[PDB]
């Protein structure tokens, strides 16, 4: 199931769109795979890099469970 480029902006930073990123997120340091949200390569890049970036800036649990 494609998620980005339909609810996203094709330009994903942390601010202004963090909720679409957190939709593949939990306070548990995990990202929903393609089996639940089958987003394409660029959308997977978006969610991966941006979510681990929010983890990197101390916005959401980096590894914390």
């Amino acid at each position: 199931y494609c998620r980005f480029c339909a609810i996203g902006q094709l330009r994903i930073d942390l601010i202004d769109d963090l909720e679409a990123l957190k939709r593949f997120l939990s306070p548990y340091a995990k990202i929903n795979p393609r089996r639940i949200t089958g987003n394409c390569q660029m959308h997977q890049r978006h969610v991966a890099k941006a979510l681990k970036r929010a983890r990197y800036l101390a916005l959401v649990p980096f590894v914390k469970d």
Partner: protein, 53 residues
Amino acid sequence: EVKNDDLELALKKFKRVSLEIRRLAQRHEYHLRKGMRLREKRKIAQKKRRKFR
């Protein structure tokens, strides 16, 4: 993992992600080469994909 305020229900929904994260950490608690790790991981991934497709 943290599921609060329930003794059994939230604990039941807990145990799934709890064991998932526990196994995710467990397969990182022993030294191994990238070969077997990736081969088995992608074999399981393709098994799940073929079961899904």
